[PDB]
Design a protein around this ligand. Structure first.
Ligand SMILES: Nc1nc2c(ncn2[C@@H]2O[C@H](COP(=O)(O)OP(=O)(O)OP(=O)(O)O)[C@@H](O)[C@H]2O)c(=O)[nH]1
Ligand SMILES: CN[C@@H]1CCc2c(ccc(O)c2O)[C@H]1O
Lengths: 54, 361, 232, 337
């Protein structure tokens, strides 16, 4: 009945959304992952004396 | 300090002791699951289990619920009289119909005593009874004739009588559970309920129950599902049974089959208004099996019962060879003795000896 | 010239049985541990060296015989307990879901170690006195018959009648039932039957020889390695 | 009437064309210049035992020392990960439970289930006991997740294609989100606690707004149901684990599926996924009795955790990024580091 009346309006609202290049997002993710790589004990094994679990 | 460690150790010891105590009582119980379709009789069985074994059996709420079913039943028959394709109709009662439509749609009703007098008179109309005999097309509650006849007894602000709770229908919004003990053994029967669903993603949770109970409406082979023009009510049950049997998760669970609602089938078969051959053409050439055990009857009704059972059994006998079993039964849910007579098959005794520690041979 | 390696080959063969037994959880799975524990590594291997007498210490022979006797009695008791548990579980399903193994082991020790530790022996005969003074094996005072009754009559008392009701339920319930039941009883009975026919024969009257009795008792000692393979 | 569908089709075509035009270069080309992390080997530092039935949910505490788990026999027990000591054992009215959560302030524990009610318990109180604080029963159909914003607000997502934001004091739904066409199975709040997502059963994921209460975006690249979801630590990307073997990493700004984590030797499903602290790892549970470890930027397997004996139904990573713990259906939890 009137279900399609609201759906088309919602889809029209969704369509008008700004989008950016994939290269910028890729660069941002790579830069963040390279910047915050120091404090990840899973990658680089923790020392035994510094490991609370051992 | 060491005091904190000692206190933590004491708390851990207490918790471990409680868990060890509870493990045995958890492991010493049997769990059962109910399944089926709408208007099949799942909750009636659990209500009867409550009535029989456990001593448990809000009376004010039941008083309103019984009257509510009576109110809905009277409106449905009259409303479809004009909308029916045939010109069937009932003179002065046309004035009664005027406020029947008005009271059909209302947030609440005060149940005036004047309503009972007019409803009883309309029920006595010859034309009104004629439309009741043709309930195949329009949907109507099964527990209608029983309540329609008994109005004055309920009318004379009253306490519900015996078997009144077992006949009234109330929808189960959530889960519906019941605990009971039969003889030094604690059981656990629960009903999933939850209206109607088509994905059943919660079925993965039930991977450890001992048995699955299946109930069908054996006297519903000419009325359609709640959403109209779909199929016969029996076919909707047959399709659901096939899906349950051929399920990845339920690959090692047995099934106990109840062919519920037996008395209605006997009454409807005696009348020749509807024939099984029309909806099920293969039944015309069907021959009764050589092995049989009729209770106490008419070969006409007896032949009908085994045909429906045969269709259900033929589904399970093909896709299941080992680790799957099917148990036919004949039950009438309302009759207290019949479920007691089944005694759950002497507690499904047949199974208890073989399934258990016999397979390893 | 070729019989030299036969004894060593048999001595090396039973090592495989010991390894298989040592290679191997629930309420009923704790009983198999006793059968796995209770012999072929120490008592059985000594026979190959004894086939030549070892004659190291007169005190050691008593332990050598008593260990084997206790192991045999423990194995018989464990199989009887297994059969009893299976019958109890199958027959009555209403109520089915360390203490008894220790009692069974304690029962074995009383009959075996006590006569050996008490130095009690057969009737003092000229051959008996000469053999005991200087490895013979023969008792008196109906010790053999009583020991057999404790350790061989238990099977026919239990194992014969334990499956009479279980197999009766097989026909009623409705092949494979007799295919595996015969293996369990057949291997048990066939290997452990012959010695009951010679121990009674020797004490009563002789009509038997030492070598044939030794061979008969050696036969069936492989039941220790046969049981681990059959179970599970 | 029928003319309405034409506008929807035209709008869908325009959206698809815009999405196609927005693509410039795949992430593989940019990220192929880095060095692989290599093999990762970890062993079970500790094992947590004491449950009777399968575990269906788990959530770490804020301090990354205490965790709460929920079983199918109706028992919530809080552990001490350092020394393996139980602290509480809370029974439940309904034995069927699918969710659990731990408050940010460590004062409440919420457990839902199939009983359609999301109850809240109290940990720190007088008399040294635990009792039900409030019971919220406004939903229809079973629940799938429960999360805490503060001590006064809790978000649930039931199986009737709805998600609501509750309120502890009032005990009524403040808002309500609608638009899905199937059961909702998971959600994960943002680090900024302003937006959250939800993976339905119609192969679609959305991006709601907590304050305004309206849908914003929609991603529908998968081919089957969706069983898990989690945000990148940045807060601008999420990874979705579906019923089929594929795992995909979407982006809020670009609105495109960047990668498709899949292997030719696996045909099983995915139950739970999560990231690491720096967003370089993508752990994922599996229905083939063990777990697996992927790489966010390389789309390759770099380690298998096979210390279990049944399927993995929950997973979590500490806020300090020091341990990774998994549950299973054989009543055993584990800690890996
Ligand atoms: N007359 C008659 N009705 C029966 C019999 N057995 C079951 N019923 C019907 O079963 C209904 C019981 O209602 P419920 O307990 O809610 O079971 P249900 O109708 O299948 O509905 P759900 O439980 O939601 O599946 C009653 O209204 C009866 O009409 C029977 O033997 N005779
Ligand atoms: C040399 N092996 C002996 C022979 C007789 C014998 C054994 C065990 C238990 C008994 O009751 C016996 O009579 C065997 O261990």
């Amino acid at each position: 009945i009137a279900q399609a009346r609201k759906l088309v309006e919602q889809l029209k609202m969704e369509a008008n959304i700004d989008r950016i290049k994939v290269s910028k997002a890729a660069a941002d993710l790579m830069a963040y992952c390279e910047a915050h790589a120091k404090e990840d004990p899973l990658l680089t094994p923790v020392p035994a004396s510094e490991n609370p679990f051992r | 300090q060491r005091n904190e460690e000692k206190a933590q150790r004491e708390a851990n010891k207490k918790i471990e002791k409680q868990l060890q105590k509870d493990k045995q009582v958890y492991r010493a119980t049997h769990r059962l699951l109910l399944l089926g379709a709408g208007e099949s009789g799942k909750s009636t069985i659990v209500k009867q289990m409550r009535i029989l074994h456990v001593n448990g059996f809000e009376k004010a709420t039941k008083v309103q619920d019984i009257k509510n079913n009576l109110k809905e039943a009277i409106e449905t028959i009259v409303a479809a009289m004009s909308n029916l394709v045939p010109p069937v109709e009932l003179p002065e009662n046309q004035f009664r119909v005027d406020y029947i439509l008005s009271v059909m749609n209302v947030p609440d009703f005060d149940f005036p005593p004047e309503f009972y007098e007019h409803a009883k008179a309309l029920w006595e109309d010859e034309g009104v009874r004629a439309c009741y005999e043709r309930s195949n097309e329009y949907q109507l509650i099964d527990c209608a004739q029983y309540f329609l006849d008994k109005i004055d007894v309920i009318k004379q602000d009253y306490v519900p009588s015996d078997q009144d709770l077992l006949r009234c229908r109330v929808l189960t919004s959530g889960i519906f559970e019941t605990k009971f003990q039969v003889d030094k053994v604690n059981f656990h029967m629960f009903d999933v309920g939850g209206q109607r669903d088509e994905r059943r993603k919660w079925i993965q949770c039930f991977n450890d129950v001992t048995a699955i109970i299946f109930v069908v409406a054996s006297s519903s082979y000419n009325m359609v599902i709640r959403e109209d023009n779909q199929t016969n009510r029996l076919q909707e049950a047959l399709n659901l049974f096939k899906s349950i049997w051929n399920n990845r998760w339920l690959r090692t669970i047995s099934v106990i089959l109840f062919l519920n609602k037996q008395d209605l089938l006997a009454e409807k078969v005696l009348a020749g208004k509807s024939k099984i051959e029309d909806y099920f053409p293969e039944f015309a050439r069907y021959t009764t099996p050589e092995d049989a055990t009729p209770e106490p009857e008419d070969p006409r009704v007896t032949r009908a019962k085994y045909f429906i059972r045969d269709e259900f059994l033929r589904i399970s006998t093909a896709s299941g060879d080992g680790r799957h079993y099917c148990y036919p039964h004949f039950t009438c849910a309302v009759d207290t003795e019949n479920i007691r007579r089944v005694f759950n098959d002497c507690r499904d005794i047949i199974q208890r000896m073989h399934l258990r520690q016999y397979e390893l041979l | 010239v070729w019989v030299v390696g036969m004894g060593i080959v048999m001595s090396l063969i039973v090592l495989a049985i010991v390894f298989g037994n040592v290679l191997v959880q629930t309420v009923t799975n704790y009983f198999i541990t006793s059968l796995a524990c209770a012999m072929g590594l120490a008592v059985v291997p000594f026979g190959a060296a004894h086939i030549l007498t070892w004659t190291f210490g007169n005190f050691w022979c008593e332990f050598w015989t008593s260990i084997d006797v206790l192991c045999v009695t423990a194995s018989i008791e464990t199989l009887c307990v297994i059969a009893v548990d299976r019958y109890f579980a199958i027959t009555s399903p209403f109520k089915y879901q360390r203490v008894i193994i220790l009692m069974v082991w304690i029962v074995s020790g009383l009959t075996s170690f006590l006569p050996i530790q008490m130095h009690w022996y057969r009737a003092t005969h000229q051959e008996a006195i000469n053999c005991y003074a200087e490895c013979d094996f023969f008792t008196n005072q109906a010790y053999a018959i009583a020991s057999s009754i404790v350790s061989f009559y238990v099977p026919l008392v239990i194992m014969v009648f334990v499956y009479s009701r279980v197999f009766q339920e097989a026909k009623r319930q409705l092949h494979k039932a007799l295919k595996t039941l015969g293996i369990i009883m057949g291997t048990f009975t066939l290997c452990w039957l012959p010695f009951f026919i010679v121990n009674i024969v020797h004490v009563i009257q002789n009509l038997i020889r030492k070598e044939v009795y030794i061979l008969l008792n050696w036969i069936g000692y492989v039941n220790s390695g046969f049981n681990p393979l059959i179970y599970c | 009437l029928d003319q309405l569908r034409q506008e929807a089709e035209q709008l869908k075509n325009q959206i698809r064309d815009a999405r196609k035009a927005c693509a410039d270069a795949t992430l593989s080309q940019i990220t192929n210049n880095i060095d692989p992390v290599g093999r990762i080997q970890m062993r079970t530092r500790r094992t947590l035992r004491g449950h009777l039935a399968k575990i269906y949910a788990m959530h770490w505490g804020t301090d990354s020392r205490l965790l709460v788990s929920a079983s199918q026999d109706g028992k919530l027990i809080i552990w001490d990960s350092y020394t393996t000591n139980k602290v509480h054992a809370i029974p439940l009215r309904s034995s069927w439970v699918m969710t659990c959560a731990y408050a940010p302030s460590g004062n409440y524990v919420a457990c839902g289930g199939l009983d359609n009610i999301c109850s809240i318990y109290n940990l720190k109180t007088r008399e040294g006991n635990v009792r039900v604080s409030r019971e919220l029963a406004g939903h229809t159909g079973y629940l799938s997740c429960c999360r805490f914003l503060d001590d006064n607000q809790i978000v649930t997502s039931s199986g009737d294609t709805t998600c609501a934001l509750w309120d502890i004091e009032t005990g009524q739904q403040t808002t309500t989100f609608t638009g899905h066409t199937g059961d909702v199975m998971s959600l994960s709040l943002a680090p900024d606690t302003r937006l959250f997502v939800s993976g339905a059963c119609d192969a679609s994921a959305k991006l709601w707004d907590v304050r305004e209460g309206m849908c914003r975006q929609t991603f529908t690249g998968h081919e089957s149901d969706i069983n898990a979801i989690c945000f990148f630590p940045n807060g601008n990307a999420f990874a979705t684990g579906s019923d089929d073997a594929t795992c995909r990493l979407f982006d809020l700004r670009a609105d495109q599926e960047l990668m498709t984590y899949s292997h030719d030797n696996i045909i099983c499903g995915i139950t739970s996924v999560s990231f690491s602290k720096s967003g370089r790892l993508l752990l994922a549970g599996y229905d083939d009795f063990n777990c697996n470890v992927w790489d966010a930027l390389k789309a390759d397997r770099a380690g298998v955790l096979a210390g279990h004996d049944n399927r993995v139904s929950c997973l979590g990573v500490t806020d300090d990024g020091m341990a990774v713990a998994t549950g299973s259906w054989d009543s055993f939890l584990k800690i890996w580091n």
